[PDB]
Amino acid sequence: TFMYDLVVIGGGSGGMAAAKEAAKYGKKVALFDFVKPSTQGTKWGLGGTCVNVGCVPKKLMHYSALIASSIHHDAQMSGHKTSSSFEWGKLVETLRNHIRMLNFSYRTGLRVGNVEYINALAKLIDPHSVEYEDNGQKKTITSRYILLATGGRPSIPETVPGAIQYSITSDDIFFLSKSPGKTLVIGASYIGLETAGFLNELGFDTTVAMRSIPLRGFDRQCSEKIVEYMKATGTKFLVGVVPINIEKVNENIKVSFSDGSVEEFETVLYATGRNPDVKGLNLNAIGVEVSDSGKIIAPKDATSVPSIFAVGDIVEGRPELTPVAVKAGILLARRLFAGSNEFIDYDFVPTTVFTPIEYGHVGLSSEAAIAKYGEDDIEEYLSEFSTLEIAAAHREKPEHLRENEMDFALPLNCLAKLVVVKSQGEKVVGFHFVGPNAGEITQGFSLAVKLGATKKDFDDMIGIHPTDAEVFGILEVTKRSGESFVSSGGCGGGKCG
Amino acid sequence: ADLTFMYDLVVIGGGSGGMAAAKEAAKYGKKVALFDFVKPSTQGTKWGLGGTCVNVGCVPKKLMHYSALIASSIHHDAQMSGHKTSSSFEWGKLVETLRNHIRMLNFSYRTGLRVGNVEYINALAKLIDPHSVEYEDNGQKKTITSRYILLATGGRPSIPETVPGAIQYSITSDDIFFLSKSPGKTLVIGASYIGLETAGFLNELGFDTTVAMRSIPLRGFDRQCSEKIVEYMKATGTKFLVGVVPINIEKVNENIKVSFSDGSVEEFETVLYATGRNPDVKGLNLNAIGVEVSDSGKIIAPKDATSVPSIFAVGDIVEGRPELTPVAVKAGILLARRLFAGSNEFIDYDFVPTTVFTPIEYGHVGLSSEAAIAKYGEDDIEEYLSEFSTLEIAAAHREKPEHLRENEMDFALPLNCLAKLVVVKSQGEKVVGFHFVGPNAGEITQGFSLAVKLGATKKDFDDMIGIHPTDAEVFGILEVTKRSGESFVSSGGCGGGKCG
Ligand SMILES: Cc1cc2nc3c(=O)[nH]c(=O)nc-3n(C[C@H](O)[C@H](O)[C@H](O)COP(=O)(O)OP(=O)(O)OC[C@H]3O[C@@H](n4cnc5c(N)ncnc54)[C@H](O)[C@@H]3O)c2cc1C
Numbered sequence: 001t002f003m004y005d006l007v008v009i010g011g012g013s014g015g016m017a018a019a020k021e022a023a024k025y026g027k028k029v030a031l032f033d034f035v036k037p038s039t040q041g042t043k044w045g046l047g048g049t050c051v052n053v054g055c056v057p058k059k060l061m062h063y064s065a066l067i068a069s070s071i072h073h074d075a076q077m078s079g080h081k082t083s084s085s086f087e088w089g090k091l092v093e094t095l096r097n098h099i100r101m102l103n104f105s106y107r108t109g110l111r112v113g114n115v116e117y118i119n120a121l122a123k124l125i126d127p128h129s130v131e132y133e134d135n136g137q138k139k140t141i142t143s144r145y146i147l148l149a150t151g152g153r154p155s156i157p158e159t160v161p162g163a164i165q166y167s168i169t170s171d172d173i174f175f176l177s178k179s180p181g182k183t184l185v186i187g188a189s190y191i192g193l194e195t196a197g198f199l200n201e202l203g204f205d206t207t208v209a210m211r212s213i214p215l216r217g218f219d220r221q222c223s224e225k226i227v228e229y230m231k232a233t234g235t236k237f238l239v240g241v242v243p244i245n246i247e248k249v250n251e252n253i254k255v256s257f258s259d260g261s262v263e264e265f266e267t268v269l270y271a272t273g274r275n276p277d278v279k280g281l282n283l284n285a286i287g288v289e290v291s292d293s294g295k296i297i298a299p300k301d302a303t304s305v306p307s308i309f310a311v312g313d314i315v316e317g318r319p320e321l322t323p324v325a326v327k328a329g330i331l332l333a334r335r336l337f338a339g340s341n342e343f344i345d346y347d348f349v350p351t352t353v354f355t356p357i358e359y360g361h362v363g364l365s366s367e368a369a370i371a372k373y374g375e376d377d378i379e380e381y382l383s384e385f386s387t388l389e390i391a392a393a394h395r396e397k398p399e400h401l402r403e404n405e406m407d408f409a410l411p412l413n414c415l416a417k418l419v420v421v422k423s424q425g426e427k428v429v430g431f432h433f434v435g436p437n438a439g440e441i442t443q444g445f446s447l448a449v450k451l452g453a454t455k456k457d458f459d460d461m462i463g464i465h466p467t468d469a470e471v472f473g474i475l476e477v478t479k480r481s482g483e484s485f486v487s488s489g490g491c492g493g494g495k496c497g
Numbered sequence: 498a499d500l501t502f503m504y505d506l507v508v509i510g511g512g513s514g515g516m517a518a519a520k521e522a523a524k525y526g527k528k529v530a531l532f533d534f535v536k537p538s539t540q541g542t543k544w545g546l547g548g549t550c551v552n553v554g555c556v557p558k559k560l561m562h563y564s565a566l567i568a569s570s571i572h573h574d575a576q577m578s579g580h581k582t583s584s585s586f587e588w589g590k591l592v593e594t595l596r597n598h599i600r601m602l603n604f605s606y607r608t609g610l611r612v613g614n615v616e617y618i619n620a621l622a623k624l625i626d627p628h629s630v631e632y633e634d635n636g637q638k639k640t641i642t643s644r645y646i647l648l649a650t651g652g653r654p655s656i657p658e659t660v661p662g663a664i665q666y667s668i669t670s671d672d673i674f675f676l677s678k679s680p681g682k683t684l685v686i687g688a689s690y691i692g693l694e695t696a697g698f699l700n701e702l703g704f705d706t707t708v709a710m711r712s713i714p715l716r717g718f719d720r721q722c723s724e725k726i727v728e729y730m731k732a733t734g735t736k737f738l739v740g741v742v743p744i745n746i747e748k749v750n751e752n753i754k755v756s757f758s759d760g761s762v763e764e765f766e767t768v769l770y771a772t773g774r775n776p777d778v779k780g781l782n783l784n785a786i787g788v789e790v791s792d793s794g795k796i797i798a799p800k801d802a803t804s805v806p807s808i809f810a811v812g813d814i815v816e817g818r819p820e821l822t823p824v825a826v827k828a829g830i831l832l833a834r835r836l837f838a839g840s841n842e843f844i845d846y847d848f849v850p851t852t853v854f855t856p857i858e859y860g861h862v863g864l865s866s867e868a869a870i871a872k873y874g875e876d877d878i879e880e881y882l883s884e885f886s887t888l889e890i891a892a893a894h895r896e897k898p899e900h901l902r903e904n905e906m907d908f909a910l911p912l913n914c915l916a917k918l919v920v921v922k923s924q925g926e927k928v929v930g931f932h933f934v935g936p937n938a939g940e941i942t943q944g945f946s947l948a949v950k951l952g953a954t955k956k957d958f959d960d961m962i963g964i965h966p967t968d969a970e971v972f973g974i975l976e977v978t979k980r981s982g983e984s985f986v987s988s989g990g991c992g993g994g995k996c997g
């Protein structure tokens with residue numbers, strides 16, 4: 001009856017994962033991926049946003065930034081007097097070489113996994129039919145099931161003159177042929193703070209235009225600590241201010257702001273948000289229902305058309321993360337072809353923001369815990385402190401950023417916080433860690449929290465010394481107490497005695 | 498009864514267990530004295546308050562390892578990350594940074610005892626009777642009496658008296674962190690965690706480094722993880738002499754000539770014994786008081802109570818518990834609460850995570866493959882694993898030193914990570930051992946150690962959402978078993994996780 005069991009539109013995190021899992025059950029699977037060029041003409045190989053213009057290149061640029069920070073702050077104190085100069089084009093070559101190998105690895109992975117990969121834009125014709133172009137000619141294939149996994153693309157405001165013509169996005173930043181120099185980042189999203197963070201660490205003059213608050217939706221205390229640290233290390237923030245006009249003035253971009261100020265930059269990067277890439281799919285003619293944001297309505301991965309499914313960044317009401325796209329794709333394949341009833345538990349989706357000091361969490365912010373349980377049923381335990389290694393190095397604020405002689409130190413690099421429900425025996429409902437290696441620390445704690453750990457389980461946990469992570473075994477200061485949660489000790493996360 | 502005693506608690510030893518118990522006791526309004534005095538090392542090194550971890554253990558070790566990691570990043574990663582660097586190492590500068598940090602910790606602990614209402618006496622104490630301790634103050638020996646006495650004197654490095662020249666010419670972990678002259682070409686004797694950590698950081702800092710290993714690396718630890726560490730250390734330039742120990746150590750000019758048990762001879766600038774540590778209890782007068790010791794010299798106190806019921810012990814001197822700072826600290830705190838606050842709480846010794854801070858680190862909790870197979874039988878065990886590279890490290894294409902190359906193709910360091918779960922099939926693949934070799938292994942292991950203590954199964958790991966990109970996310974996607982015999986090697990470049 002159908003040429004295929006499953007046709008996947010999109011060769012990113014969710015699409016590649018669903019397609020390969022489906023083919024393991026002996027099913028006939030096709031996958032389409034084609035990269036429409038960015039607003040500045042950037043394009044790239046198979047594997048989607050994470051592989052090409054997301055998690056992978058972002059993590060490599062952050063690693064370069066952490067090396068720059070250790071050479072500047074730490075190396076001499078560790079006995080390694082080091083002079084260095086940064087070559088943007090060399091970091092870009094390293095990123096491009098690594099991503100080019102991943103492109104080929106994913107191409108081979110689909111073929112070996114018995115998935116037919118077609119490098120073409122696909123569009124829906126009917127609930128069982130997909131159209132694409134091959135060598136001039138439009139062809140149709142039929143499938144029992146169709147998965148939409150086309151992800152998102154950066155948003156640039158149409159209502160700001162010159163924004164679309166002169167600005168770059170995350171689609172362009174990792175591959176720029178020339179260093180960005182003096183840079184404006186618009187948006188205090190995780191993408192904007194990560195990007196501003198690594199550009200400032202690499203030595204670029206960096207400004208963030210923040211419409212309101214940093215990391216809207218994340219814990220306020222952790223979000224503000226990140227901004228405090230970024231400011232102390234040289235990122236400038238324009239608070240409550242957005243570009244209204246962008247023009248080329250000689251070799252620079254002249255930006256006019258919503259408060260009447262004007263400033264020239266070499267690079268202007270929009271990191272405001274991402275829109276789901278669905279306008280080309282012909283959703284309205286097929287009867288696939290979309291929300292007011294343009295995302296697909298598919299709370300259990302099933303669209304309004306029962307033969308059409310969706311996972312990843314295009315689906316309303318789920319976090320835009322690689323592991324959530326991957327796991328949704330795999331579990332969908334198992335429900336379709338292996339009689340699984342398994343769904344992701346969306347209450348336990350940990351995440352990490354790779355800012356100059358990183359931020360990992362799972363469960364509820366202080367604000368969401370207070371909203372759900374009430375202030376009286378919540379205890380917040382916290383400690384702000386320095387990594388042992390970093391404390392010994394005596395990191396100092398750049399001279400130009402000091403308010404006075406007293407303002408010499410960087411802020412403490414770590415904040416550990418547990419959010420607990422008193423009526424459930426101080427069950428942990430929120431875990432928060434700001435500091436180095438925050439993703440590495442949060443991963444295992446996120447499983448402990450998912451399994452129902454209480455404050456008592458944390459207090460009875462034997463520490464690994466010396467680590468930052470061991471701090472979670474010895475939290476005692478509460479927000480309610482109003483006592484100082486600052487530790488000026490030098491043994492790091494843990495107690496030497 | 499208590500009215501006959503000057504103190505509620507007298508603590509002998511101002512290290513991890515002693516300072517923790519003393520301060521916890523004083524929080525309940527009890528009258529507490531603490532003795533600490535540092536007998537100089539076999540090479541005359543001495544230091545301030547705070548014990549082995551603060552002065553000559555975890556703290557200086559972690560700072561030297563951080564310096565080693567910086568050296569490795571500059572050498573292997575910086576240019577690939579776009580940072581063209583020139584660098585040189587000054588041993589004296591690293592030692593100054595350690596000494597400044599440790600001097601501030603000495604001062605901070607001195608302050609913390611005073612503020613915490615603990616009377617600190619800088620003198621050696623010894624037992625007189627079950628309620629009495631003696632020390633010297635300005636020539637004169639004084640006695641103080643106490644309801645309870647805590648012994649927390651820790652250990653000191655062991656050097657074999659039966660090896661001629663060993664005691665005269667060798668240094669130990671007591672000396673290495675403060676040497677006035679950089680160690681140069683160095684022999685480390687012992688493939689203990691202390692020996693491999695010390696050899697690891699000296700090699701990373703650029704010293705010609707040899708380990709003399711009597712038998713196996715990291716005896717008592719998982720064999721597969723221990724062998725992976727030695728493979729990595731060899732690939733980065735540490736030389737291993739297997740089944741060979743020094744039998745003679747002699748001065749020849751400015752160098753130390755070492756004669757080995759196999760008839761080989763080699764000259765070094767520095768010889769460091771990292772064979773083991775003996776409990777420092779010989780001066781406490783334990784025999785006359787009736788405090789029972791094992792044949793190793795450790796105090797018998799499985800619940801912290803010695804054979805004398807007014808005398809307690811915690812930390813490295815107690816038979817049958819791990820020699821770790823957090824186990825000393827937690828034991829001292831819980832002892833103080835059981836004595837003065839009606840607590841019933843003891844450490845659960847089944848879940849004591851640890852990390853070896855080798856050039857690639859190794860964290861674990863629960864059972865090795867060997868102990869799980871010994872306890873449950875091979876047929877009831879599954880081992881799931883993945884060997885792989887950290888994303889950022891894979892992108893850097895780290896290379897072996899030229900002297901270790903065997904061909905055009907032999908360029909790469911080994912993969913830096915190994916993740917392993919040891920599960921019991923009959924208990925629904927309950928996890929009984931967690932193992933991670935790689936960067937940040939202590940940071941990764943801490944949280945997983947709580948999940949394992951709470952009874953996590955393979956299914957709980959498989960249903961855990963990963964944080965991407967991390968090494969730790971690999972624990973959500975383990976599928977290759979040892980039993981399968983299939984390759985557990987991943988040569989992909991997305992790191993711990995799958996991008997699709
Ligand atoms: C700068 C940045 C950093 C990020 N960092 C992280 C991070 O550290 N951790 C993390 O977990 N997540 C991160 N993310 C998010 C992550 O990249 C996404 O959540 C994830 O890639 C979404 O997967 P997906 O399957 O929904 O789609 P994508 O991976 O976006 O793949 C969709 C694919 O479909 C293609 N396509 C679109 N329309 C069609 C069509 N009609 N026919 C054919 N092909 C089509 C696209 O070109 C693309 O290749 C980051 C994102 C960005 C932008």
Ligand SMILES: Cc1cc2nc3c(=O)[nH]c(=O)nc-3n(C[C@H](O)[C@H](O)[C@H](O)COP(=O)(O)OP(=O)(O)OC[C@H]3O[C@@H](n4cnc5c(N)ncnc54)[C@H](O)[C@@H]3O)c2cc1C
Nearest residue numbers: 510512514534548549550554622650651812813820821822
């Ligand atoms: C090189 C090295 C690295 C280590 N790394 C780590 C690590 O990374 N993580 C970890 O958890 N553990 C580590 N350890 C172990 C850790 O240092 C110990 O487990 C811990 O310090 C033991 O605490 P304690 O209370 O038993 O005694 P100690 O901390 O050893 O303190 C005992 C104190 O008592 C004093 N003393 C002895 N006799 C007397 C007396 N009669 N009167 C008065 N004072 C006396 C001693 O001088 C000393 O100050 C390491 C050890 C070494 C040697």
